[PDB]
Amino acid sequence: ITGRPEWIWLALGTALMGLGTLYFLVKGMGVSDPDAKKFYAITTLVPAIAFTMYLSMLLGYGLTMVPFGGEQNPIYWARYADWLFTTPLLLLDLALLVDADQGTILALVGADGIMIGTGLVGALTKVYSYRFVWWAISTAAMLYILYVLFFGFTSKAESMRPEVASTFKVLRNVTVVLWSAYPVVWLIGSEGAGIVPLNIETLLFMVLDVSAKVGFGLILLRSRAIFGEAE
Amino acid sequence: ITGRPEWIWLALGTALMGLGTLYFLVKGMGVSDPDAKKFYAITTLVPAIAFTMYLSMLLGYGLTMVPFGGEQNPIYWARYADWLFTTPLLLLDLALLVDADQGTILALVGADGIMIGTGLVGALTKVYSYRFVWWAISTAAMLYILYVLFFGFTSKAESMRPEVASTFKVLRNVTVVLWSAYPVVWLIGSEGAGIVPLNIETLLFMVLDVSAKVGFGLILLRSRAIFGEAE
Amino acid sequence: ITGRPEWIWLALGTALMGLGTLYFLVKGMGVSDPDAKKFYAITTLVPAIAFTMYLSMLLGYGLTMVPFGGEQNPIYWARYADWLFTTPLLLLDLALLVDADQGTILALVGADGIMIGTGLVGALTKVYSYRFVWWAISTAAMLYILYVLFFGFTSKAESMRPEVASTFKVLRNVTVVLWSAYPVVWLIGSEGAGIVPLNIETLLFMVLDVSAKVGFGLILLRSRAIFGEAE
Ligand SMILES: CC(C)CCC[C@@H](C)CCC[C@@H](C)CCC[C@@H](C)CCOC[C@@H](CO)OCC[C@H](C)CCC[C@H](C)CCC[C@H](C)CCCC(C)C
Ligand SMILES: CC(C)CCC[C@@H](C)CCC[C@@H](C)CCC[C@@H](C)CCOC[C@@H](CO)OCC[C@H](C)CCC[C@H](C)CCC[C@H](C)CCCC(C)C
Ligand SMILES: CC(C)CCC[C@@H](C)CCC[C@@H](C)CCC[C@@H](C)CCOC[C@@H](CO)OCC[C@H](C)CCC[C@H](C)CCC[C@H](C)CCCC(C)C
Ligand SMILES: *C/C=C(C)/C=C/C=C(C)/C=C/C1=C(C)CCCC1(C)C
Ligand SMILES: *C/C=C(C)/C=C/C=C(C)/C=C/C1=C(C)CCCC1(C)C
Ligand SMILES: *C/C=C(C)/C=C/C=C(C)/C=C/C1=C(C)CCCC1(C)C
Ligand SMILES: CCCCCCCCCCCCCCC
Ligand SMILES: CCCCCCCCCCCCCCC
Ligand SMILES: CCCCCCCCCCCCCCC
Ligand SMILES: CCCCCCCCCCCCCCC
Ligand SMILES: CCCCCCCCCCCCCCC
Ligand SMILES: CCCCCCCCCCCCCCC
Ligand SMILES: CCCCCCCCCCCCCC
Ligand SMILES: CCCCCCCCCCCCCC
Ligand SMILES: CCCCCCCCCCCCC
Ligand SMILES: CCCCCCCCCCCCC
Ligand SMILES: CCCCCCCCCCCCC
Ligand SMILES: CCCCCCCCCCC
Ligand SMILES: CCCCCCCCCCC
Ligand SMILES: CCCCCCCCCCC
Ligand SMILES: CCCCCCCCCC
Ligand SMILES: CCCCCCCCCC
Numbered sequence: 001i002t003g004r005p006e007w008i009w010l011a012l013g014t015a016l017m018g019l020g021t022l023y024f025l026v027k028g029m030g031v032s033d034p035d036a037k038k039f040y041a042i043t044t045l046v047p048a049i050a051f052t053m054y055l056s057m058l059l060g061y062g063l064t065m066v067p068f069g070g071e072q073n074p075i076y077w078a079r080y081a082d083w084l085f086t087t088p089l090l091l092l093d094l095a096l097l098v099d100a101d102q103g104t105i106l107a108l109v110g111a112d113g114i115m116i117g118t119g120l121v122g123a124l125t126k127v128y129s130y131r132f133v134w135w136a137i138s139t140a141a142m143l144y145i146l147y148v149l150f151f152g153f154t155s156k157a158e159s160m161r162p163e164v165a166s167t168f169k170v171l172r173n174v175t176v177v178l179w180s181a182y183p184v185v186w187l188i189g190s191e192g193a194g195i196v197p198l199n200i201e202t203l204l205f206m207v208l209d210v211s212a213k214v215g216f217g218l219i220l221l222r223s224r225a226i227f228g229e230a231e
Numbered sequence: 232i233t234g235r236p237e238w239i240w241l242a243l244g245t246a247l248m249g250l251g252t253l254y255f256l257v258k259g260m261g262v263s264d265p266d267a268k269k270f271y272a273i274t275t276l277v278p279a280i281a282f283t284m285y286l287s288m289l290l291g292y293g294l295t296m297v298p299f300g301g302e303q304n305p306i307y308w309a310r311y312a313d314w315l316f317t318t319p320l321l322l323l324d325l326a327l328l329v330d331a332d333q334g335t336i337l338a339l340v341g342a343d344g345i346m347i348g349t350g351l352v353g354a355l356t357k358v359y360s361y362r363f364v365w366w367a368i369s370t371a372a373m374l375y376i377l378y379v380l381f382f383g384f385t386s387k388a389e390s391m392r393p394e395v396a397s398t399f400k401v402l403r404n405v406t407v408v409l410w411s412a413y414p415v416v417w418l419i420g421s422e423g424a425g426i427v428p429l430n431i432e433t434l435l436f437m438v439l440d441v442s443a444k445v446g447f448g449l450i451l452l453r454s455r456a457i458f459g460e461a462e
Numbered sequence: 463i464t465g466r467p468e469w470i471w472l473a474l475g476t477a478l479m480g481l482g483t484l485y486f487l488v489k490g491m492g493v494s495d496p497d498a499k500k501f502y503a504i505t506t507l508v509p510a511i512a513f514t515m516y517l518s519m520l521l522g523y524g525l526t527m528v529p530f531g532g533e534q535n536p537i538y539w540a541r542y543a544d545w546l547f548t549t550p551l552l553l554l555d556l557a558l559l560v561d562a563d564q565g566t567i568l569a570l571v572g573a574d575g576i577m578i579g580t581g582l583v584g585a586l587t588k589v590y591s592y593r594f595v596w597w598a599i600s601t602a603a604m605l606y607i608l609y610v611l612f613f614g615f616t617s618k619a620e621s622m623r624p625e626v627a628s629t630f631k632v633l634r635n636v637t638v639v640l641w642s643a644y645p646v647v648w649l650i651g652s653e654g655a656g657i658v659p660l661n662i663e664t665l666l667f668m669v670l671d672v673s674a675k676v677g678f679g680l681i682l683l684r685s686r687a688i689f690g691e692a693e
């Protein structure tokens with residue numbers, strides 16, 4: 001484990017995702033509202049999945065070597081197995097908050113799968129220049145997601161209860177800022193141009209992951225928007 | 232790329248799926264009917280997924296070598312990753328058109344997963360004679376799907392609006408004819424008996440894919456069956 | 463095939479899953495109740511999936527070698543591909559029986575995916591002591607599932623029709639007893655401590671699989687709880 005300088009950030013990430021999972025699990029014990037139960041189930045699964053994948057990276061299972069640039073490059077593939085399941089769950093939290101229609105939910109989840117799937121292909125591609133073709137396709141899929149979150153959901157939240165509109169607006173802004181950083185870290189990190197070393201890259205993804213999952217969840221599960229209007 | 236004679240058909244397929252995706256995306260911009268939005272989302276995702284997998288084959292990522300018959304045989308595995316997601320989406324288009332019940336939808340999607348999954352196992356199997364055992368199981372799963380589309384959905388469409396009944400009947404006939412060709416191309420192509428060479432096999436799958444996805448989508452999204460009855 | 467002593471139990475399992483699939487398929491022909499159709503579709507898919515994965519193990523495709531303990535250990539990875547899809551389908555049978563809320567269904571299916579996913583990682587892990595870390599995480603996920611089936615569903619079934627309450631109680635008890643045996647067989651078998659040899663381990667999993675899928679299905683599909691109350 002300790003033979004890799006980035007191990008400290010993988011261990012911290014593992015701990016923070018595990019602690020986040022347990023807090024949400026305990027906090028959700030005393031909840032019977034069927035609407036609130038939906039948000040607790042979605043939001044608790046997110047850091048639980050991330051916990052297992054951070055642990056796999058810490059123990060060395062989620063790491064492979066990819067030859068490109070005449071070098072064997074360490075690629076943590078477990079990140080994409082994490083994101084494949086956690087990013088659509090996070091979008092479902094937002095879509096259920098605004099009572100989005102089914103067709104829009106399917107478009108979001110499908111574009112998200114394309115985003116993560118093409119990012120994985122780009123991470124494992126051995127022809128250096130082709131890695132950035134996949135990065136560009138994946139980034140186009142992300143821009144579609146961000147467009148929908150702004151010019152489809154925002155207008156839908158305003159016609160909703162005030163507390164669900166204000167909570168959505170906050171979580172929307174958090175998501176757009178944090179998610180946009182991921183393609184940048186990829187491009188300048190060891191998967192892309194190799195400007196930033198792997199140990200610093202790992203620290204950046206850990207800050208982003210914890211903020212986008214545990215920070216996101218703390219804002220959502222403390223809001224009254226997750227409960228139905230009741231007397 | 233150009234070192235493979237089949238590259239021209241992979242490049243054409245990539246272009247036609249990309250163009251198809253963009254047309255459906257633009258055409259769906261001016262749509263607010265929640266029913267129509269469902270069909271546009273399903274139908275636009277189909278060629279978008281196929282685009283990415285054709286590109287992976289063009290660039291050489293979606294290709295592996297499988298030893299059988301005393302030879303290293305080029306097997307494009309990316310086809311099955313495509314079909315795993317696009318064939319159930321196409322069946323969902325048909326099932327939603329006739330307002331099929333949930334139990335029937337699950338049976339269709341499950342049989343479809345078995346069809347594609349066993350076809351993938353057959354494509355990667357190293358014992359030559361066993362490849363055709365998997366082909367037979369996969370073909371049995373397809374025949375179940377075709378039976379349901381005829382002796383379960385057809386009777387359901389007649390009790391529906393006339394425009395949804397006539398549109399379903401057309402898309403049903405297109406699907407049964409085109410899908411039935413796939414097991415035949417597999418059997419006589421490089422995955423099976425090896426009668427037809429890979430470059431011709433690739434041309435045939437490209438014609439079938441574009442017809443079953445973009446041609447299918449053009450018929451559906453030009454129909455009024457996708458809109459609810461409104462004044 | 464016959465070069466492996468466990469082949470006899472893989473062949474028996476294949477036959478019993480295939481026969482089970484055909485019986486459920488025939489029995490479900492004469493069913494039009496939309497509620498009953500749901501249970502028949504879920505319950506017939508379970509042994510059909512298991513059939514294909516037992517066949518892959520029989521023919522040698524679903525087997526790999528994992529080095530640990532200074533030895534190349536035969537690991538049947540196809541079991542986890544089976545369980546990944548069949549265990550959530552079995553939980554869906556139970557959840558639909560008691561009309562569970564959506565949030566609870568998602569929590570069950572998500573915990574089940576974590577259970578199977580971490581068990582697969584543990585089966586393929588090359589550092590011997592780490593294999594049991596994954597076993598423990600997977601077992602914690604199972605205990606969560608069992609808790610929900612007892613202290614969330616049981617109370618919900620009592621407020622239901624008497625026949626659905628008594629049928630659920632029976633299937634609940636069958637599930638908790640049979641599922642609990644799996645982590646024990648893993649721990650003492652070739653994936654874990656290696657006390658029980660592989661051929662005996664394979665026999666035990668076959669008895670458990672057939673009971674948990676075909677036996678489970680025979681109890682459910684003979685009950686009147688799967689039909690709506692009708693005159
Ligand atoms: C509606 C939305 C959900 C739609 C989703 C969008 C999606 C279509 C976007 C594209 C996804 C696609 C790129 C997934 C590729 C997975 C692949 C990286 C797995 C590893 O295989 C890659 C190479 C080794 O580098 O295999 C070496 C050769 C091996 C012999 C490969 C044989 C196994 C194949 C991988 C079998 C295909 C399985 C499916 C891809 C499983 C789904 C994986 C997940 C990442 C989507
Ligand atoms: C309700 C419906 C959706 C049900 C679906 C029906 C489905 C059950 C039908 C059978 C599907 C099954 C054959 C999928 C097999 C995937 C497999 C080809 C992936 C590549 O692995 C094959 C060998 C190399 O040749 O791995 C070499 C050895 C490696 C060490 C393998 C270890 C990884 C395992 C593959 C882990 C299992 C992952 C799941 C199979 C992922 C789903 C893939 C998709 C193709 C279903
Ligand atoms: C809501 C719920 C459904 C959530 C589900 C819970 C889930 C997150 C729990 C953890 C699942 C995770 C451990 C799955 C790992 C699959 C992995 C074993 C496949 C084989 O790859 C392992 C190594 C060889 O030993 O690959 C060698 C290196 C290769 C180069 C690997 C590159 C391919 C990657 C495997 C791509 C990721 C694909 C996804 C993991 C596909 C889903 C598989 C299924 C088992 C979940
Ligand atoms: C909890 C994890 C989250 C919210 C991860 C989000 C990840 C992304 C938005 C990743 C995007 C990428 C691109 C847009 C292209 C480059 C490759 C990716 C996958 C890093
Ligand atoms: C857009 C792609 C489509 C509609 C693909 C359809 C593919 C099939 C219907 C494939 C069927 C197969 C068999 C029936 C057995 C032989 C292997 C397959 C997977 C080619
Ligand atoms: C039809 C198959 C069924 C119902 C299989 C159930 C399997 C389990 C409940 C497996 C559980 C495991 C653990 C709890 C940890 C050890 C590894 C597993 C996956 C065997
Ligand atoms: C979206 C965030 C990207 C900003 C990356 C900042 C990295 C600064 C760290 C110093 C770079 C290390 C280079 C010298 C080793
Ligand atoms: C009462 C609110 C705080 C509860 C404690 C939460 C502990 C989980 C770890 C959170 C750290 C990361 C927060 C986002 C920066
Ligand atoms: C379902 C369509 C299958 C028909 C295949 C027709 C192939 C004819 C092309 C000529 C065969 C090439 C053999 C000589 C190289
Ligand atoms: C107005 C209808 C035609 C629009 C142009 C569609 C261009 C997408 C490519 C379609 C070619 C394949 C059609 C099926 C044979
Ligand atoms: C949950 C069931 C686990 C019980 C396992 C009993 C196995 C007894 C078979 C004899 C053990 C073989 C050891 C000598 C070869
Ligand atoms: C009339 C009920 C029996 C029908 C025959 C079922 C045959 C399928 C194989 C069942 C054997 C396994 C039963 C569970 C132990
Ligand atoms: C194995 C991959 C299957 C999933 C394909 C994605 C489409 C799923 C459609 C689900 C239809 C709704 C069923 C109720
Ligand atoms: C990782 C594979 C999980 C999918 C298994 C297929 C069954 C899914 C059941 C979904 C139940 C409906 C939830 C609302
Ligand atoms: C185009 C939709 C408007 C909202 C999206 C904001 C774009 C942020 C740019 C992200 C940069 C990634 C490289
Ligand atoms: C048996 C259901 C009737 C409709 C299915 C038509 C069968 C077409 C044969 C396809 C040939 C594939 C080898
Ligand atoms: C803790 C929830 C109560 C019901 C679960 C029964 C636990 C059975 C123990 C299984 C042993 C697996 C190692
Ligand atoms: C080795 C660098 C080659 C540059 C390729 C950049 C491709 C980016 C595509 C974005 C449209
Ligand atoms: C090398 C050819 C061996 C023939 C096997 C055919 C199997 C087909 C099974 C269809 C029932
Ligand atoms: C080689 C045996 C090492 C023992 C590790 C046991 C780990 C079990 C963790 C359960 C909390
Ligand atoms: C609940 C605390 C979980 C912390 C265990 C993971 C941290 C790795 C320490 C080496
Ligand atoms: C929108 C046009 C997309 C065409 C790019 C793919 C074709 C491959 C050319 C080499």
Ligand SMILES: CCCCCCCCCC
Binds near residue numbers: 473476477
């Ligand atoms: C319907 C009977 C299915 C039996 C075939 C599988 C058994 C393997 C025999 C070698």
Ligand SMILES: CCCCCCCCC
Binds near residue numbers: 211218
């Ligand atoms: C993106 C930063 C999240 C901050 C988490 C703190 C929330 C406390 C209510």
Ligand SMILES: CCCCCCCCC
Binds near residue numbers: 405450
């Ligand atoms: C299967 C052939 C499809 C033909 C596509 C043309 C549709 C234009 C309306």
Ligand SMILES: CCCCCCCCC
Binds near residue numbers: 636676677678681684
């Ligand atoms: C767990 C044992 C199941 C027994 C199956 C027999 C059911 C006949 C109704």
Ligand SMILES: CCCCCCCC
Binds near residue numbers: 169170173177
């Ligand atoms: C009005 C809410 C502002 C939230 C933005 C937070 C950016 C990290």
Ligand SMILES: CCCCCCCC
Binds near residue numbers: 177180181
């Ligand atoms: C909408 C604000 C985008 C912020 C992008 C930050 C990328 C590091």
Ligand SMILES: CCCCCCCC
Binds near residue numbers: 401405408
């Ligand atoms: C009555 C519609 C006929 C459609 C069949 C088209 C076959 C390619």
Ligand SMILES: CCCCCCCC
Binds near residue numbers: 408411
């Ligand atoms: C229902 C007509 C089937 C046509 C099969 C064509 C196979 C090449």
Ligand SMILES: CCCCCCCC
Binds near residue numbers: 481485488489
């Ligand atoms: C295995 C075939 C079953 C025969 C019919 C059983 C009575 C519905």
Ligand SMILES: CCCCCCCC
Binds near residue numbers: 631632635
């Ligand atoms: C009251 C029903 C008892 C069922 C338990 C069966 C254990 C195999």
Ligand SMILES: CCCCCCCC
Binds near residue numbers: 639642
């Ligand atoms: C609730 C009874 C548990 C039985 C466990 C059996 C494990 C072999």
